[PDB]
Amino acid sequence: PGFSGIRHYEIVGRAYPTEKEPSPKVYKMTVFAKNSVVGKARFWKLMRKQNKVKKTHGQVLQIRRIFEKNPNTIKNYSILLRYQSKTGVMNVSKEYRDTTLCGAVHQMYMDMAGRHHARYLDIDIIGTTVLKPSQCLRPHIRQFLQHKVKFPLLHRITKKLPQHKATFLYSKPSTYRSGFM
Amino acid sequence: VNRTVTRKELKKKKHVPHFKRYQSWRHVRVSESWRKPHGIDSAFRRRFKGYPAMVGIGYKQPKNVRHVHPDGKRQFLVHNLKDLEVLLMYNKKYAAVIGHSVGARKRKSIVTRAKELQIKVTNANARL
Amino acid sequence: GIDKPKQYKNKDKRHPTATNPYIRVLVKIYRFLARRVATPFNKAVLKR
Amino acid sequence: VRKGPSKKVTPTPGQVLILLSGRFRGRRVICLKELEHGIFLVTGPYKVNGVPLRRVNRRYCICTSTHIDISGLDLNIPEAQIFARRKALKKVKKALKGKRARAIQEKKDQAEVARPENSFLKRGKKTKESKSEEAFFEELKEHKKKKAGFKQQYQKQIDEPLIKRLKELDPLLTKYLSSIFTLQVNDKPHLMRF
Amino acid sequence: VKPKDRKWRGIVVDGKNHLMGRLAAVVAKQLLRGESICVVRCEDINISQSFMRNKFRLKNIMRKRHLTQPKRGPFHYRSPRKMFEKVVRSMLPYRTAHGTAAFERLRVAEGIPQPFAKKKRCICPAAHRILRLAPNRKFCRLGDLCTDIGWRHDKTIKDLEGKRKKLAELRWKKKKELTKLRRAAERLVDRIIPRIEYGDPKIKIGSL
Amino acid sequence: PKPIVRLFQPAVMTGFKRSKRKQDPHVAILAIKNVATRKHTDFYLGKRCVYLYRGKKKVAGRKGSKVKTNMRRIWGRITRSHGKAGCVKAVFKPNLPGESIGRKVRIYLFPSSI
Amino acid sequence: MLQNQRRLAKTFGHYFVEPEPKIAFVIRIRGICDMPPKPKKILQLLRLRQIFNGVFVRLNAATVNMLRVVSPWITWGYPSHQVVRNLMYKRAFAHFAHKRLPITNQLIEKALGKYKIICMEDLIYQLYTCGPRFREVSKFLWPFKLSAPRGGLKSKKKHFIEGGDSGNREIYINQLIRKMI
Amino acid sequence: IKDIALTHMKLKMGHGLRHRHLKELVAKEDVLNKWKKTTVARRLEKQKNKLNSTD
RNA sequence: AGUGCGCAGCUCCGAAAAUGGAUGGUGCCCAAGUCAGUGUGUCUCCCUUACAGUCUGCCAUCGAUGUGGCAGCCAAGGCAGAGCAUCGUUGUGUAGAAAGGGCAUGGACAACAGCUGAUCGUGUUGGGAUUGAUCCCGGCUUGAGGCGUUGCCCA
RNA sequence: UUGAACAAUGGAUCCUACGUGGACCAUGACUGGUAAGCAGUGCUGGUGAUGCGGGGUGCUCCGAGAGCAGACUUACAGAUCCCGAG
């Protein structure tokens, strides 16, 4: 895909060392957020509500935006998430073929918004994993997990720049051509 | 200063609109002369979107060009040769406007003396 | 617009309310003195 | 493949320009030299284009990518005598307020403008008059006639070795310059290089 | 052709296989921009939903009448051309001088009459039913809807269009022969003077 | 006859600068032919433009032509772009009339900078 | 030196706890009508009386507990050195003699010579790196007036973490100042 | 797929072929010339040459 | 692979009022509905514009400074609650207010050696000035049983 | 380290002429009532006294506050057309 508007961060934090607890525990979250502001926000939203450590009493040791190692090979990311609805919480497992994990996460977010009207701040990413093509359980993924998938472009509409979007097109179009112009 | 106002600065006036009393166009009793609206529901006084302009001080013009006429000169209402001799030294800043009641006999002398002094008379050609 | 503080108005009185031209002459003299001698006494007399 | 930086497209000696406005719209001319900053002396030869020795703003001409290689031609011209001032009594409408900058950027302009000469009585322009509407008209006619005859000297002095050069270079350039540039329905000026 | 239409010049838009309101909106914006447009074949315009849905929509539209005097009430036209003119009217500010100027630049017609059959007609890609509607989706025909609510002239225009198409086929075959021999003439001249094309490094001042 | 030559680009006056319910009659919007992106307006930025309309009386023609004409001219300049679809904001003097909307305007290639 | 500490930490597998920020540029994003009394008073105390006015503030307990309570009306963030420099050299005016004077070296010498501050470089230095005389410099400064930003605000009403344009943009206030100068 | 357009030809290769082999395949199969000889190539080239043509 | 429970998104039923009518109209259906993302000082198209923000000019206000002849010289100013020069701030407003500033009417006391049969005043019509109250002038009517400008006082 | 921060043309001492003393709106802070564009309250802000941009229209919503102009930029909110902006 293109421009997954999401950056992956591996944030590491703890609490300010008090004199009763001179070495507080250290927690490392993995946050897929638009930017580091939202990332640290989610990190502290988990620090409070899972450890009673508050952004004002805590201390970030690392943030570390993570870049995709090899973005030129397609992977099948299974994302396990939970989200809030009008009624309570629901657990979801979805999977996406993408070249980047941030790409698959942007795909997951827009897919959840589409199918379930879920929102970013109402989705909480439980673990993510990468699957071998023998481990993908969904049909719309197993159909592309073949080696030589092949299909035509049939009712194509020939996207074209606004510079030459014919307002009157004195020719006759054809939805089944190759569409160079 | 015996200096006429230039056209350069006459054309930099600030476009006073044609202020009128509100609804002076409905009735002949309501005259054209401006009056500040004091109504309670008046949309004019409340300055609604498409209503006419409200007389204010933002429209007042700089001191250099305020009361200056399209001639480039201020005006001075004269009735005697005394007032011409007064304007003797400011023949470029001022223009001698003869009073409307000054007769033809004194208008003749005023016009003569003012054209020797080279003061402009805005109403030189009035009666003969 | 701006949430203004109070725009400065000088409390002190700087014009003689007296109608006597000679009191006004004295105000002129002591304006001169409070300016170009600038002593507390001259400023006080100008006030008064 | 190199985009490179941006440069001020400017006419050079021997560059084919296209006049954008005036008596000669869209005619292709040869830039000879620059007279003032932004004003150039051009001529699409009076035999080729019909455009005489002329001046042009850099702003009313298109600077095409056609260079003529005008090397080795006599381009010396009495510009002041040929092109009159047309505004007589050069800089007197009000008594000079003083030019009270003393060394640089007023004196360096006033001296540089007191250097040049003046088109004298024949090569200068004639301001209009009546003289029974004819004693001026006839004399203006012969004044214009002799001025044109004096300009034809220099114009042919340039145009006889300039056509012998463009024919020497390649023969189609004379018809290239004889043809006038127009816009048609499928020509988009914002996309046409020159 | 009548005199006022003999005087006519503008663009001709084939309304066939077009979505009615998208057509109307493109036509309206262009009329406002000052074009003269003639939307021809308004019986073959398409509308985006089921035939029955659009039939009931038209029924509930024609339900609206001035109760005091209907002859002054909303007019509900039975001609496809006039229905289209009213949709375009709605898209235009027809109650101003420039709005009525645009609406009078609009030149809707049924079938393909003569001042417009003598002209090259075009299509709006946006507003074209094939290029716009998903094949999954249903659609109707304005001539079907208008014959449903009345409009006794569908078949009358079908016959005339068949005649026009036969004449067009004759002219098309003559044009095919003429373009054959015009390519012949072009090649004959290509022998004499070879065509110099843009893709040429030879065009230069050391050549040419 | 002499060769009539075309050294301008046509545009349409698409109304004045305006919000939904009020307008600025000083800044006219012009849609130029075959210009349909904002990137293509950088050519016409700064160019001069004339709006031609016909009066009844004969006004003086070109400067020095000394022949009159029924045409009348309002000159302006293309000052900036307007939006994304190839419209420009031009300023005229005097302000463009009201029946100028939906009408053609010539945009000359000068002042040229290429 | 900070970069060298980070280099050594990354080398040997340690955590460089980045020094917590000391200054913050605070910009008034919201307007002036419908103002609750306590936010109104705190914005007065911050000298943010005009919309799109900015001030430098020290970040400590006292100032942060005010920034929190007036956050729905302000953004703030940690400006970069060059952003501070651009602000000072293009937007800075002196609050001196009960006037709003354009900063000059002579005016700086007059108003702050007491503190061995003579040039605009001194102001920029104290502001960026607080220094002892940050208080005097900031008081000497007049609250920056900034234009309505190019590009614009996403949404005044939400928080920056909620996609909006309020609260703390820890480093994304450089992107905002750059649009506002 | 809205951005691409399909050319008449195809290569015999596996997924994610490296440059080392893909360049030698396009060379051996002569895809650049087989493309430049097509009709669409010449339409596009006439368009682009009209574009980049000087006066 | 099949069979159960369920849970969320959209859709359908549930869904009935009286003039003809209203996502504002048109209409829209891979939307012109709906849910997300994106438009980056970077973008083939992320642009529009409020009387809001920024810069500038002018008006007015409230101030600060130097002055308001003992001045470098001319020009200007030269009525000390005036004027002059520079700078800064601030401009919504009902009721209400101003020891803030003015326009205007009748008449007394004064000044204009004011104007007027070479045509007063009124009125009418054009023009110019003014932010404005209003002021000045040309034309015509008209013809005196006249009028105006400034200070101040009595209404 | 003049011993918390931030702000601050301000503190003290008085005199004095008026208008007002029907209010209303919004919010889990509520009380009476089945409820009400009902009645009565609390904090704050608005309307009244307030125009301007948007909500088609609307005294109270959202933005923002209003000397006269020029340029740029935006808020709320918007871009099928009406209607500026894909």
Q: Which residues of H touch E201 (CB under 8 A)?
A: none
Query: With b meaning 16 or more CB within 10 Å and e meaning fewer, what string describes D126-165?
Result: beeeeeeeeebeeebeebeeebeeebeebbebbbeebbeb
Cβ neighbours for F51, distance < 8 A, ≥ 6 positions apart: F13, F73, F74, F76, F92, F96, F100, F103, F105, F106
Q: Where are the alpha helices (DSSP H) in E138-206?
A: 142-148, 154-192
Other CB atoms within a 10 A radius of the CB of residue A155 amount to: 11
Contact F14 E33 (CB under 8 A): yes
Within 13 Å and on the Cβ side, how many CA atoms surround E136?
Answer: 1
Spatial CA neighbour of F109 closest among F52, F45, F29: F45
CB-to-strand J under 7 Å, chain F 67-96? 79-80, 82-85, 87, 89, 91
User: What distance in Å separates the CA atoms of residue C40 and residue H4, rounded to the nearest whole number?
Assistant: 89
Q: Do A153 and H6 lie within an 8 Å CB cutoff? A: yes
Please give the Cα distance from A79 to A95 (Å, whole number): 6
Nearest to B115 by CA among B96, B93, B94, B100: B96
Kindly report the number of other CB atoms within 10 A of residue A124's CB atom.
Answer: 13
Q: How far apart are CA E106 and CA A89, in angstroms?
A: 57
Q: How far apart are CA E66 and CA E69, in angstroms?
A: 6
What secondary structure letter does DSSP report for D180?
Answer: P
- Specify the DSSP element, H or E, that contains D184: none
Dist CA D42 CA D29 (whole Å): 6
Q: With contacts defined as CB-CB under 8 Å, which chain F residues touch E11?
A: none
- The structure tokens listed for E6 are 């003999």
SS3 at position A175: coil
Give chains near H: 3+ CB pairs under 8 A.
A, D, E
**Which residue type, as a one-letter code, is found at position A28?**
K
Quick one: DSSP state of residue E106? B
- Cα–Cα distance between E156 and E152 in angstroms, integer? 8
The token pair that represents G126 in the structure block: 């104290």
The β-bridge partners of A80 are: A93
Partners of residue A28 on adjacent β-strands = A12
- SS3 of residue B31 by DSSP: coil
Asked whether residue B48's C-beta has any atom of DNA/RNA strand J within 7 A, the reply is yes
C-alpha G58/C-alpha G131 separation (Å) is 11
DSSP strand pairing (E140-141 vs E121-122): unpaired
Give the span between the Cα atoms of A96 and A76, in whole angstroms. Answer: 6
Q: How many CA atoms lie within 13 A of D138 on its CB side?
A: 4
In angstroms, the CA D53 to CA D152 distance is 9
Is E80 within 8 Å of E45 (Cβ atoms)?
yes
The angle formed by the CA atoms of residues A113, A114 and A117, to the nearest 5 degrees, is 50
Nearest to G25 by CA among G83, G79, G66, G81: G79
* CA-derived radius of gyration, chain D: 20
**D-F interface: how many C-beta pairs under 8 angstroms?**
56
Cα maximum dimension of chain C: 48
**Token pair of F13, please?**
């006056």
Does the CB of E91 sit below 7 A from strand I? yes
Q: Indicate which technique resolved this structure.
A: cryo-EM
Give the rounded distance of the alpha carbon of E119 from its chain centre. Answer: 11
Q: What is d(CA A160, CA A157) in angstroms, rounded to the nearest whole number?
A: 9
Using CA atoms in the order A15, A18, A23, A27, what is the torsion angle rounded to 10 degrees? Answer: -10
CA of D165 to C1' of J18 (A): 99
Residues of A in contact with H39 (CB under 8 A): none
Which distant-in-sequence residues (6+ apart) come within 8 Å of F39 by Cβ?
A: none
Q: Using the beta-carbon criterion (under 8 Å), do D173 and E205 form an inter-chain contact?
A: yes
Q: Contact H2/A181, CB-based, under 8 Å? A: no
Q: In the 8-state DSSP scheme, what is residue G66?
A: H
Residue A180: name the closest of E199, H47, F40 by CA: H47
Residue A13 has phi, psi (to 5 degrees) of: -150, 170
In whole angstroms, give the CA distance from residue H32 to residue H48.
17
Is the shortest CB-to-strand distance from G159 to strand I under 7 Å?
Answer: no
Count the neighbouring beta carbons within 10 Å of the beta carbon of residue C17. Answer: 6
Query: Quick check: F6 and D184 CB within 8 A?
Result: yes
Q: Rg of chain B's alpha carbons, rounded to an integer? A: 20
The protein footprint on chain I, as nucleotides within 7 A of a CB, is 7-10, 19-21, 25-30, 32, 34-55, 57-60, 62-64, 66-68, 70, 75-76, 80-81, 87-92, 94-95, 99, 112-121, 128-134, 136-139, 146-147
**Angstroms from H15 CA to nearest CA on chain E:** 32
Question: Could you check: is the Cβ of residue G114 within 7 Å of any atom of nucleic acid strand J?
Answer: no
In whole angstroms, what is the distance from residue D166 CA to residue A91 CA? 83
Chain E CB contacts of D69 under 8 Å are 205
Q: HSE of E111 in the Cβ direction (CA atoms, 13 Å)?
A: 18
Give CA–CA dist A14/A25, Å, rounded. Answer: 6
Q: Number of A to H CB contacts under 8 A, please give it.
A: 22
Rounded Cα gap, residues E170 and E168, in angstroms: 5
B30 touches strand I (CB under 7 A): no
Q: Which residues of H touch E197 (CB under 8 A)?
A: 46, 49
> At how many degrees (to 10) do helices C21-36 and C40-47 cross?
150
In this complex, the residue with its CA at the shortest distance from the C1' of nucleotide I92 is: B46
Joined together, the tokens standing for residue D27 give 């005619």
Phi first, then psi, for residue E43 (nearest 5°) are -80, -20
Helix (H, G, I), strand (E, B) or coil at F81: strand
Q: Which of residues 6-45 of C touch strand J (CB under 7 A)?
A: 6, 8, 11
Structure tokens at B5: 């106002």
Q: How far apart are CA D38 and CA B16, in angstroms?
A: 42
Q: Helix G61-69 and helix G37-45: axis angle, to 10°?
A: 130
Q: Tell me the nearest-neighbour CA distance from E196 into chain H, angstroms.
A: 12
CA distance D111 to E46: 80
Reduce the DSSP state of residue G16 to 3 states and report it: coil
Residue found by looking up tokens 């066939």 in the block: E16
Pairing verdict, β A123-131 and A75-84: antiparallel
Q: With beta carbons less than 8 A apart as the criterion, state whether F106 and F9 touch.
A: yes
- How far is F92 from F48, CA to CA, in rounded Å? 10
**How far apart (Å, rounded) are the C-alpha atoms in residues D58 and D40?**
7
Do E16 and E129 touch, CB atoms closer than 8 A? Answer: no
The answer to whether G96 and G111 have CB atoms below 8 angstroms apart is yes
Chain D contact probe: residue of E198, E205, E207, E208 with most D CBs at under 10 A: E205
Distance CA E102, CA F102 (A): 9
Number of DSSP helices (H) and strands (E) in chain B, helices first: 4, 2
Q: Which amino acid is at E77?
A: Y
Closest residue by C-alpha to C1' distance, nucleotide I59: B58
- How many Å is the maximal CA-CA distance in chain B? 61
Q: What is the Cα–Cα distance from B95 to E100, expressed in whole angstroms?
A: 55
Phi, psi of B68 (to 5 degrees): -75, 140
| F88: three-class secondary structure by DSSP | strand
Pairing, β A7-15 against β F48-60: unpaired
Instruction: State how far the Cα of D155 lies from the Cα of D166, in Å rounded to an integer.
Output: 16
Q: How far is CA D182 from CA D52, D68, F51, F108, F109, in A?
A: 20, 22, 20, 12, 12
Structure tokens at G103: 């900063």
Q: Which of residues 18 to 77 on E have a Cβ less than 7 angstroms from any strand J atom?
A: 21, 25-26, 28-29, 32
Cα R_g (chain E), whole angstroms: 23
Q: Which amino acid is at G141?
A: L
Is B115 in contact with B81 (CB distance < 8 Å)? no
E25 neighbors E48 (Cβ within 8 angstroms)? no
Decide: D15 and D63 in contact? Cβ < 8 Å: yes
Residues forming beta bridges with residue F17, ordered by sequence position = F24
Sign of the dihedral defined by the CA atoms of residues D184, D188, D190, D194, in that order: negative
Provide the angle, in degrees to the nearest 10, between the axes of the packed helices G81-91 and G120-128: 140
Nearest to residue E42, comparing CAs of E29, E55, E27? E27
